[PDB]
């Protein structure tokens, strides 16, 4: 019969600025593999992508990317659909009004897809789409009976100092209600840490939990090993990169600088999205010999992570729910360069297999300095074995092609189950 995956994503066609856009990019590259696979399972599969209307002045807007995505989905009998979100199309976030309108039009896209298909898997991400499952199932009648909802990419929790907004709380509480309330509403967890935390925090029954695990397209050309000549060409000791730290987002860059004051000969190399004055000031109050980069391309980070002059890559975010960054370092450094240092918070311990594939550290400056020592204290033969455990774990646990096929199969299998009853 005719199966549709309806992907409700806050960015990733018109705009591409973060994780969600990356996931959409990876997800499209896998579409054909997914369609072949599901074909042999008895389903002809359509991909529908819903993204809120952006206007062309928005950060990360790109008419040609939107064009490419639209034409990619059309050529395989699917569609990209821009969604009304009661806003001015400048940011992919908002408060109650944005969330409520975007959820309503996302729900409409789900139910319109349900009218010309026999089954729909509705994958919605983030608080902006959190009300789509409740809105579809309360009001959609028999059309809603053709739909399974997988809600993914976040639920408001209490594992950060920063208190989320009334809009996030209410939207995420609503989908949690509907996850407990309806057989057709599942949560897609992106990490072992969110599976456990959401089941704990929101009392989600385990049969309403489905995997949508963070992973990477490891056979992408951007992940290839580089010769030292290519390495030195591009970079003309301890690496961190990501977005700039902020209110509700504490990427622990300051923790490396502090800890670097008492680490002899270790140089932080920090590649943040936009240039950082407070990190330049924090690196001066200790006169630490840091290296503060901005908007660095992954071509360069990969070289920097692969250098034999690079000792570790550190990941110190307060509570990353499903960071792919440490998976990336583990995978590009599969032959040479960094071993990963991960904080004991978020999904980071899972990524480094709790010490077998990287160094787990507490989130203090003292423990982080001791962490850099602990990886330095490692023999040549142990750096070999840890490096190979890291690559094998990415290969077995955090492969994008396999984890999204798991998501498909679990979703399809769950659709059959509820249609049985």
């Amino acid at each position: 019969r005719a199966l549709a995956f309806v992907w409700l994503m806050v960015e990733g066609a018109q705009v591409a600025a973060g994780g969600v856009a990356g996931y959409v990019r990876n997800l499209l590259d896998e579409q054909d593999a997914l369609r072949d696979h599901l074909a042999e399972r008895g389903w002809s599969v359509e991909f529908v992508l819903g993204e809120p209307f952006y206007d062309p002045g928005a950060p990360g807007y790109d008419e040609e990317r939107w064009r490419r995505v639209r034409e990619h989905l059309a050529a395989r009998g699917g569609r990209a659909v821009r969604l009304v979100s009661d806003s001015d199309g400048l940011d992919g976030w908002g408060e109650e009004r944005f969330f409520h309108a975007l959820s309503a039009t996302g729900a409409q896209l789900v139910l319109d897809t349900a009218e010309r298909c026999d089954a729909v898997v509705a994958v919605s991400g983030t608080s902006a789409f959190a009300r789509v499952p409740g809105m579809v199932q309360r009001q959609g009648g028999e059309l809603a009976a053709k739909v399974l909802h997988v809600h993914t990419f976040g639920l408001a929790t209490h594992d950060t100092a920063h208190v989320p907004s009334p809009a996030e709380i209410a939207a995420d509480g609503d989908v949690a209600f509907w996850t407990r309330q309806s057989d057709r509403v599942s949560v897609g967890y992106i990490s072992r840490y969110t599976a456990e935390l959401y089941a704990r925090t929101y009392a989600i029954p385990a049969a309403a939990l489905l995997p949508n695990r963070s992973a990477i397209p490891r056979h992408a050309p951007r992940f290839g090993v580089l010769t030292e000549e290519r390495i030195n060409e591009r970079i003309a000791f301890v690496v961190m990169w990501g977005r700039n730290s902020a209110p509700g987002l504490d990427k622990g860059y300051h923790l490396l600088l502090e800890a670097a004051r008492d680490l002899p000969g270790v140089v932080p190399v920090i590649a943040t999205r936009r240039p950082d004055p407070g990190l330049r000031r924090l690196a001066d109050r200790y006169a630490v010999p840091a290296v503060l980069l901005d908007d660095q391309p992954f071509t360069h980070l990969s070289a920097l992570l692969q250098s034999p002059r690079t000792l570790a890559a550190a990941f110190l975010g307060e509570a990353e729910p499903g960071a792919v960054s440490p998976m990336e370092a583990m995978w590009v450094a599969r032959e040479s360069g960094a071993l990963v240092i991960a904080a004991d918070t978020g999904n980071l311990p899972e990524v480094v297999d709790d010490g077998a594939a990287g160094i787990v550290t507490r989130r203090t400056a003292a423990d982080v300095a001791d962490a850099v020592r602990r990886v330095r204290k490692l023999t040549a033969d142990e750096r070999r074995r840890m490096r190979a455990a890291a690559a094998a774990r990415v290969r077995a646990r955090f492969d994008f092609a396999a984890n999204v096929r798991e998501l498909a199969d679990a979703a399809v299998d769950r659709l059959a189950e509820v249609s049985k009853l």
Copy 2:
């Protein structure tokens, strides 16, 4: 490149039929093929999209078969009906902030999706439920929004009534008023002369954003047929009408807080109109009206919940002197139109209070009698109808019927709406 779409955003009319908006939709679909031939003559290939909120099957007025005929009628002509998410349980076609915001959001979605696949869209949105659609489309739809003309109709929250609208209604209606002044693509569709003037004055709606969606009746509908005296007498025989007397007929909803329909004015005024017997058919039975009738010793016939087949009979009867319309401010009553049209060969002349759209209906005295809203004045208007000779009576009746043909024919007023919408689309381009 001549793919035109009319997107009708309506709170009922396919799944559910319980009021004026539903009759508008049913009448609109009867005119669809005629409208398609007409707009074709102007070079446009027209499609109809109907959007209506999701209803639960157990809701008042649900009919699954009607929903199916509507949807097959649209589909047979390259159109579609689309049920809209309204963030509600689907048991009532109204609501507050949540209902309005979601329905306007998904109504705005269906306008833009239609914009994506057609060269031009007229988005006819109705009532406060849909009042934020024009703004939501025009604020955020970029280029697809440049293919849309908005015609928002069926009301704006006003002040000439004891009824104070809900916060949700005020805000939605204020928002669309804002957008008619903000945007060349946002028109208000006025239903009468009285609301065109009221909306320009109340909401500073610019003149260029006022567009005709003038209320009207499907003249040719069977229910508007002329009856023979034989058939009239059959139908009225079981209504309890005295052997003698001249009838002044009144019908509608019961007068309630916020809605004063003026039945008490006809009973007061009857105390000094010997030979006249009020005939009043409300929706539910009225103790206060029969109590008030007894106080004044006036022999009013009070009826409970009548088919229009019967009102038609009463109105055409040579025994009926007048049909009175004495409400406080109807923006677009069609009941007077209905009386003027069924009495086109015999029966009532219309008495109209000087409020709302009633003066326009009776052409300010030429197609009917205008009265101030006092018991004495109503009495004087009944006397003025009695004093009319059979010739003045016949000429008024001719004018009234002719006025319905020329001003309140549904077929031509909806074609008026389309032509103005298209002319206005060409003008913003």
Copy 3:
């Protein structure tokens, strides 16, 4: 630094009285003097502040004299009652997003205002309409918020009823559940053992964030007195009871969309229990119940708006076999507590459904009969009540009465709440 305030945010119970929440406020104010005394020994001078939404004088349950009494009762003791803006017409006592949000904000305002002139505040908020208060106060109130313990009581949206709560309900209760897990100063006030379990399972409310506010009755109220046989027979002679037949009594609100009070299971089950005469007393007359009763050919006294002095007499009469409580999922019904307590000398034994707090009330079978919610088992349970030995039935009557003394005394349970909160207040320092 001894000035302590209890701020009671209640949707009714002063301007309007109509349901459980109103009864709670009545019982709470009669206990005020005893709580002041008790809390004095713990080193607290106690002030009672009551916030209730503004009600229009035309609202159901509106009593201008009760509002005055509540206002003076509180003023007499250094407290005050406060009418709170709710952004509504003042007529429902309930609503959707706008009513909840506005009431919560002004409820939150009154808490912080009270915090400013006192040293510590216990904010006792009830129902979804005030569920946003704790978060609103704790997120913005700065150091004033650090003087407050929140005890949110009287409901959380759950999944144990066929009717699905409104988005507004889901959202506001989701919000207080987040603040309960988030903040040390936000507890949920459970009204029954059934909700304590449900709320900690469904919402993952920690155990340290659960305070008792257990439903109860004020046992020493004059209405609850034991009646001589004379007064019993006199009061029931004006009710139309069959001269023969054992009675199975039910009373409460009419069953509505949302609230299934299972009067119909008793009717369908009585078709297999001869000699049994159901007596049902609803808020308003129930024509549907009569239709069902006749359809089953079953002889049921059906009553409405009965004064409790008469339900009590019906319940104590030795003609009454059982009182039945078959609600779908009442979280904190006190009606079975009233039956167990009035019938302490004679009359009914309780038949309780196995849902909601009813099993707790009847000690899971030691103090009444537990039944599945089907006609077959309801009839099985009426049979079990009559198939009880003389001794089994006096044991159960004694156990029912004592259970009310031990676990459903209002004076004790409101002191349990006050003590739990002053303790918890101390712990948060």
Copy 4:
């Protein structure tokens, strides 16, 4: 009998970063005068101030100011009241959630005031309090019958490129509905431009429009005339070039809906040899440095400047003009300050042809009017240069006299008080 003025203000006590906070400040300093005045009219007056809760991190927080305002009020039998706005307290703005909560608590404060008073004038400000009048008048019964609402400081209009948010459109439409509906709801216009625009745009009847016209407290020490010595020493630290004539602009930074026009001056200066822009924004502005650099214009770019230094700049004979080039300021008092402090020496005013600015400069008699383009602003700087010394002296004099005649805060808040008291009487 007992009259209460309830001022519902989004800032002014805990925070002070903008126009509303300047008004509260002027209002408190005039408190004793206003009540001596209203006592002359038979009214005992108390002031009540309602401001949303802010937390100490918010931009512009000062715990000492909150105690000053709070205690000054209480010493006079009044009270300041912090208000729940369902927000984090970090910003005096927001969307529907913030407006709805702050209006609801705003309304509560009015009704609680009306309960202990015979009459209340509820002066609400900006969209955040726009729903207050409708909440009190719908749900307050007889307490509402003691209230006259004057809603002031803005209504969503169509005179900016940027479209006001749905939240603003809905809040302001609601108060406009109630202005037309209810006898007890007035809109308080702050300028001739807004009296006319709001009446035409919202069909506000004239009997529902009340004066709250923008003005400055002329006699406050901060407007004192400075000596050249005191001017010179105050500006020595601002980094001014030893050569050049300054054209001064100050205010908050341009933002998405807030076109302050600083860039027009930088554009213009590419064709004004000898002119140095001096632009003092609230926070440092790298966008303007990029603009000055892109245009090769030697602008002096300041931030967080105290008024003492702004005044000196303005009084300095090295200053040719102070420019005010906002897209559509409804009621900016910035140009009135410049006209008032330059009353013996210094700048003349250049005003855009939009918003209240032509009113401020008397349509060209008290300052120079320019269209809002680079070429027109450049031309306007040349026209100030080309004035004779006698013409410059008479236009400085005309400017100072205009402030005294039309923008005296003590007179204009008395105008508000008197009109509101008169309107209270007429409603009975």
